Amino acid sequence: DKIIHLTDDSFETDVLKADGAILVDFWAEWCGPCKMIAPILDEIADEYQGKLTVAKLNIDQNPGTAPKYGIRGIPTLLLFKNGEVAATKVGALSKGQLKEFLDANLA
């Protein structure tokens, strides 16, 4: 609803040429902790309305993008600000932990 479902070809417009912050989630369907954080990202998309957009890139359906950011372990959350990565988070985390990651790095 508020989340951008990204693709390899839409990555530049959606993330790189966006005028503000984008929390990108690199994930896969077989990844248990990815699925664990997905309902949390829904909550974040809603709560951070006007501060950032949440965007998801499935690394199997869109295989091209993740090598460009050195992604290995998933889920990987990259906070982009105006096309540049500001903050990196690897592995699963709680809602309360994500908030702290966001609040600290959004300043």
Side-chain angles (χ1 to χ4, degrees), residues 4-5 12 16-17 20 32 35-37 43 47 49 52 55 57 67 70 79 82 84 87 89 95 97 102-103 106-107:
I4 306 181
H5 303 275
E12 195 197 278
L16 304 196
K17 288 189 166 185
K35 296 186 280 179
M36 190 162 64
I37 70 160
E43 275 181 291
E47 309 196 335
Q49 199 174 319
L52 63 73
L57 188 133
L79 180 65
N82 279 82
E84 306 151 31
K89 187 101 234 168
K95 193 191 175 181
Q97 292 172 326
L102 293 179
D103 290 7
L106 280 175

Side-chain angles (χ1 to χ4, degrees), residues 4-98 100-101:
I4 306 181
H5 303 275
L6 307 164
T7 63
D8 282 339
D9 303 309
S10 102
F11 196 76
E12 195 197 278
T13 303
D14 287 355
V15 183
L16 304 196
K17 288 189 166 185
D19 198 353
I22 311 280
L23 182 64
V24 180
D25 166 39
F26 293 94
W27 73 287
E29 174 62 33
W30 52 259
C31 155
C34 302
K35 296 186 280 179
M36 190 162 64
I37 70 160
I40 288 157
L41 295 173
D42 291 335
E43 275 181 291
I44 292 305
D46 284 341
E47 309 196 335
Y48 285 76
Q49 199 174 319
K51 293 188 164 212
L52 63 73
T53 321
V54 185
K56 300 174 96 182
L57 188 133
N58 182 293
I59 61 131
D60 287 310
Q61 288 167 315
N62 308 105
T65 297
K68 305 181 179 305
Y69 298 100
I71 308 302
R72 265 178 167 108
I74 55 171
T76 306
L77 306 175
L78 299 187
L79 180 65
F80 283 83
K81 299 172 148 176
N82 279 82
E84 306 151 31
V85 175
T88 299
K89 187 101 234 168
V90 184
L93 73 167
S94 76
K95 193 191 175 181
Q97 292 172 326
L98 188 43
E100 280 201 0
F101 174 74

